[PDB]
Amino acid sequence: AKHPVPKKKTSKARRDARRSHHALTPPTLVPCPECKAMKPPHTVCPECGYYAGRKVLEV
Amino acid sequence: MNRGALIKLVESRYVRTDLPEFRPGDTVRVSYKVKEGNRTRIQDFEGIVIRIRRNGFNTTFTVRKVSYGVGVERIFPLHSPLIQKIDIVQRGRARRAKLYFIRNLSDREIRRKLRADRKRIDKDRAAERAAKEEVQK
Amino acid sequence: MIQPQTYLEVADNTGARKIMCIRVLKGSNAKYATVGDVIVASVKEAIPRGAVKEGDVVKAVVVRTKKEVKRPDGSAIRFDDNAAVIINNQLEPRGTRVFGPVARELREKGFMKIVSLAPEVL
Amino acid sequence: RHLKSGRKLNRHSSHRLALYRNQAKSLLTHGRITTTVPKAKELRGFVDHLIHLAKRGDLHARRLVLRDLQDVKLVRKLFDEIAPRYRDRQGGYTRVLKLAERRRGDGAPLALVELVE
Amino acid sequence: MKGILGVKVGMTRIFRDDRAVPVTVILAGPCPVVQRRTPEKDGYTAVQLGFLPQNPKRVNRPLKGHFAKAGVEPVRILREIRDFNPEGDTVTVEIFKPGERVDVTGTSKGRGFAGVMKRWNFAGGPDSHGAHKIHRHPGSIGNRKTPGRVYKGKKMAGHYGAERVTVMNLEVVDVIPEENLLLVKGAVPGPNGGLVIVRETKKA
RNA sequence: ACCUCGAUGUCGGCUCGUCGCAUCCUGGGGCUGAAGAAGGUCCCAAGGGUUGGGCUGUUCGCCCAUUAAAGCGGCACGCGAGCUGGGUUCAGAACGUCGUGAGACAGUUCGGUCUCUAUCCGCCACGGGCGCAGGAGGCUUGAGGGGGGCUCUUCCUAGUACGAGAGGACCGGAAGGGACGCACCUCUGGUUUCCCAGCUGUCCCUCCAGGGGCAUAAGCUGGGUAGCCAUGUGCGGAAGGGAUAACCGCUGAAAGCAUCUAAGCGGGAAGCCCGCCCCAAGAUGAGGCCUCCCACGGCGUCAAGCCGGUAAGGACCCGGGAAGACGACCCGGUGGAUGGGCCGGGGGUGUAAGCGCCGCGAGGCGUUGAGCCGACCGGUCCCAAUCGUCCGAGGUCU
Numbered sequence A: 001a002k003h004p005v006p007k008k009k010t011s012k013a014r015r016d017a018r019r020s021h022h023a024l025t026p027p028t029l030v031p032c033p034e035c036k037a038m039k040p041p042h043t044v045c046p047e048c049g050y051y052a053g054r055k056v057l058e059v
Numbered sequence B: 001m002n003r004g005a006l007i008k009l010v011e012s013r014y015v016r017t018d019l020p021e022f023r024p025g026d027t028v029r030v031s032y033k034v035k036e037g038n039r040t041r042i043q044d045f046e047g048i049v050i051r052i053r054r055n056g057f058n059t060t061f062t063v064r065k066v067s068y069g070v071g072v073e074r075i076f077p078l079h080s081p082l083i084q085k086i087d088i089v090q091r092g093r094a095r096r097a098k099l100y101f102i103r104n105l106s107d108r109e110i111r112r113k114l115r116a117d118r119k120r121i122d123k124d125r126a127a128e129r130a131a132k133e134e135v136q137k
Numbered sequence C: 001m002i003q004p005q006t007y008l009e010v011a012d013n014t015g016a017r018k019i020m021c022i023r024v025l026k027g028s029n030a031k032y033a034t035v036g037d038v039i040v041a042s043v044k045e046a047i048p049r050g051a052v053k054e055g056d057v058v059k060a061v062v063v064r065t066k067k068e069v070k071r072p073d074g075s076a077i078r079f080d081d082n083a084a085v086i087i088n089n090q091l092e093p094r095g096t097r098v099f100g101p102v103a104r105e106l107r108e109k110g111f112m113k114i115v116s117l118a119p120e121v122l
Numbered sequence D: 001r002h003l004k005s006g007r008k009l010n011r012h013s014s015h016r017l018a019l020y021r022n023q024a025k026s027l028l029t030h031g032r033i034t035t036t037v038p039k040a041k042e043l044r045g046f047v048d049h050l051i052h053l054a055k056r057g058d059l060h061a062r063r064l065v066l067r068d069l070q071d072v073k074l075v076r077k078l079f080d081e082i083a084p085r086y087r088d089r090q091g092g093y094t095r096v097l098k099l100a101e102r103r104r105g106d107g108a109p110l111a112l113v114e115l116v117e
Numbered sequence E: 001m002k003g004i005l006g007v008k009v010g011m012t013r014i015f016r017d018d019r020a021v022p023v024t025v026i027l028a029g030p031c032p033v034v035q036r037r038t039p040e041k042d043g044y045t046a047v048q049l050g051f052l053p054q055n056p057k058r059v060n061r062p063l064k065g066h067f068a069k070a071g072v073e074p075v076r077i078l079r080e081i082r083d084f085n086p087e088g089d090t091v092t093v094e095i096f097k098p099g100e101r102v103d104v105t106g107t108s109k110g111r112g113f114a115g116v117m118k119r120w121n122f123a124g125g126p127d128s129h130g131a132h133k134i135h136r137h138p139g140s141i142g143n144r145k146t147p148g149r150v151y152k153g154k155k156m157a158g159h160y161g162a163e164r165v166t167v168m169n170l171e172v173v174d175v176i177p178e179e180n181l182l183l184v185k186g187a188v189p190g191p192n193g194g195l196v197i198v199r200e201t202k203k204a
Numbered sequence F: 001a002c003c004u005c006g007a008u009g010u011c012g013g014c015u016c017g018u019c020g021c022a023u024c025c026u027g028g029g030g031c032u033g034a035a036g037a038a039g040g041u042c043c044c045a046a047g048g049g050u051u052g053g054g055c056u057g058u059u060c061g062c063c064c065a066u067u068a069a070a071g072c073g074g075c076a077c078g079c080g081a082g083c084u085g086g087g088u089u090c091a092g093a094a095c096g097u098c099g100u101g102a103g104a105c106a107g108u109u110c111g112g113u114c115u116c117u118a119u120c121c122g123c124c125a126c127g128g129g130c131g132c133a134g135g136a137g138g139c140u141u142g143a144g145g146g147g148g149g150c151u152c153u154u155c156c157u158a159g160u161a162c163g164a165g166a167g168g169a170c171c172g173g174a175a176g177g178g179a180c181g182c183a184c185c186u187c188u189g190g191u192u193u194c195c196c197a198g199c200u201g202u203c204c205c206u207c208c209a210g211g212g213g214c215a216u217a218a219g220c221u222g223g224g225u226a227g228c229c230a231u232g233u234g235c236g237g238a239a240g241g242g243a244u245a246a247c248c249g250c251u252g253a254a255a256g257c258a259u260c261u262a263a264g265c266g267g268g269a270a271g272c273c274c275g276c277c278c279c280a281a282g283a284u285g286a287g288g289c290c291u292c293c294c295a296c297g298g299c300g301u302c303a304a305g306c307c308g309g310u311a312a313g314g315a316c317c318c319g320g321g322a323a324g325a326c327g328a329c330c331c332g333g334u335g336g337a338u339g340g341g342c343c344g345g346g347g348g349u350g351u352a353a354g355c356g357c358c359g360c361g362a363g364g365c366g367u368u369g370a371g372c373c374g375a376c377c378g379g380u381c382c383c384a385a386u387c388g389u390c391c392g393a394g395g396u397c398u
């Protein structure tokens, strides 16, 4: 039981207006040079590989 | 643009070169101009060089002199337009760069820590004199 | 740089040998005192039967400093101590001799009589 | 504030310098290596320097690679097997590629550091 | 009021008669006339100046139209200067004779979020005696119920730097018509390579 | 004694100021038992400033050394969700005094736990949405606001005015200081966490040599680039313009004289306002300028918009920064030098390892100012910003 303290139960809008700045930016992405896959900028897709740096997975 | 530091050097027309070489760990004297009240003197000031702060043009060196029972130090800039003559007197082995201990421990105990770097002596003694014959012919 | 409660040495035959500053004589609310400046000191140590004995309230001029001295000719100069010469309202020093190097700085301040009897000026 | 010179860091000095020393071993033993982006972005430099000393032919260099690699059989490999493959190359002796995935329970980004070949 | 556009390269020192003058060096030459300001169509007199050429590698902005409307060539950035109506050409530092006083305006070094001491030269508090948690804290901001609030303009913790900081009455040492340079009394703001503008000193 | 018996914690100090003026200093003016300077007295005026210590809990006060002065007062005797427990009127203990007592004292002494989580207002800073009658890039004006304003000493005029000497000026001009404020790294001076070297003990690589770990979260020590700062540097207060306060006049009547006011005019303070510096168009009054972009595919039967691809531009992503808590601001994205690597310059540490010579030796000497290298200044496509995604106008009315 201590120091500063809320005085009045923060209302609903009160609680909610703070939370506008909290919604998530959806992930940005590009399509793979070769794959028909969707993939981040400046990345290596979790299926393909590249053309100067492997990734090549398996069956 | 890509000359950012050449600019300062270009500003360095105030550059001399008749300065002889040396390095921390040896004694030397300068000769300096002081507004001697009514006039100006050549204040010969002989001592040990202690620190050397290099930065191209504004490179400074600090000389220490024990005068009349008082440990003094004196800081001069290399390209100072006040150095008439300046001639070394002796050279010595370094082992370290700066030497802020001759401050505390100033005595005969420095007459054994200095020691005569006789290597550069021959070097100094070489071009000083044997190259005089490479002038008189 | 010399502040109150700072044992200076004594550079003249005035008698004393170690004094502590009280206040700087360079202005109202002023901080330090490099060379060439006058201070009020209290002789805290002095040769027996001198002209200024212990526990006195003197006026002395500072001629040394363990701080550096950015002389306006670029050059700099420093000593291994702090030393003053005891003077008076008449400014002229009260001893009959001064020893130790004294900075050029003083000569400009009209303290001619000291750089006159200087053993070496720097 | 700070950062007017230049560095990347985390955790104390010894840990940091030893970490840079453990990767080189974990690099020169494999090649393709997957760590975190900033741990990698600082690992390129600590490697090439050593690689570049090894391109030199001087046992001086070895003891300066031994200074960070306490295992000869990890460095005699580096010399007479790695360093030649980078002769006639004025630098660049390390590739680093951002990955794409990111581990569970950490959310941290990942990247790959393969010795360029 | 005269004016010229320069950039900071650093500072060293020259020597004068028999003393060392700390200076600072600035590249300010190639500033071309661009757009002026007419007391009839704009409301005042002021001359746009650009500096630091730059090959058009993004400048596809309408700023490309700005330079064709005056035969100018692509500059990095470009600023104005009031009460300065020179000749529709290129203005260099050669209007600055070794003697005039100057007024430099540059950027401030950004010192990030700041402590109230550092920011306003307070004293923080003791190193000892009590609390420990007050070695660099503000220490008291108000009274009590009267007035009850906290004043405006109250020096509190925040942000120091990145502001326009004008300094005044620096004197020119020499000037270089060969490589286009300007030198003054040293203490000029800004990092060694940033925005910095020069103009005559307000006086008589 | 109306307020607080579910805390009004009752004196100062540390920082942080703010206001008041009945003014401490500086400024302006009158009378003076004002020769001169100096002084006293009062009228106007907060602009700025009002030192550091000794003594005890002290604010109060006496003192020290200075000083242009070392002003008084309000803000809960300003300020414990900022600090301070120092005392004060807890529980312990002892001295004095009252009762035979248990205890008591507006007497004394020693010791004696001050609550990490700021909900709302307030404030210092920084952002997202929106708006600014189409959209975007860049450059500016200044309604409005804020900040600083201090002050001594010396000198020429001239030891002239004045006074009998001593003393000793007004107006003007010049130079030097003290503090305070804004910026800076060239020098001075600090740091710089592994940049360089030396040293011990131990444990390792590999026995010698050489090298690594640990002894901090550096093992210790000596030096230190960049960067950040003060003790160091540069600059500032101001000059100048107008209107005023106290005061001083000119013209002149009411009131055939007089009068600064009742019509009217001038001089007049560091004080008022411009000038100086900084923010600033959220200046719903939302500005001004230059430039670049340009219709409707179809629904909404008339409407304000809608479900989609664009322009100029922007963001996203990246590499990054003397920019920065995120965010924001700025440079660069293969036409590029943004980061890392590498080269060289600066610099830092100061003769690397090896070999050889010398010494029974620890060690020294030549290769050697060698070896190593973080930022600084530039260079070089060697590695990495490759590839691309997303947003976004289609111009209301008399």
Ligand SMILES: [Mg+2]
Pocket (backbone or CB within 6 Å): C115, C116, C117, C118, C119
């Ligand atoms: Mg003499």
Ligand SMILES: [Mg+2]
Pocket (backbone or CB within 6 Å): D006, D007, D008
């Ligand atoms: Mg970094």
Ligand SMILES: [Mg+2]
Pocket (backbone or CB within 6 Å): D011
């Ligand atoms: Mg950790």
Ligand SMILES: [Mg+2]
Pocket (backbone or CB within 6 Å): D014
């Ligand atoms: Mg450790």
Ligand SMILES: [Mg+2]
Pocket (backbone or CB within 6 Å): E125, E126, E127
């Ligand atoms: Mg402190």
Ligand SMILES: [Mg+2]
Pocket (backbone or CB within 6 Å): F035
């Ligand atoms: Mg009389």
Ligand SMILES: [Mg+2]
Pocket (backbone or CB within 6 Å): F046, F047
């Ligand atoms: Mg006032």
Ligand SMILES: [Mg+2]
Pocket (backbone or CB within 6 Å): none
């Ligand atoms: Mg320094």
Ligand SMILES: [Mg+2]
Pocket (backbone or CB within 6 Å): F217
């Ligand atoms: Mg610990």
Ligand SMILES: [Mg+2]
Pocket (backbone or CB within 6 Å): none
């Ligand atoms: Mg000043």
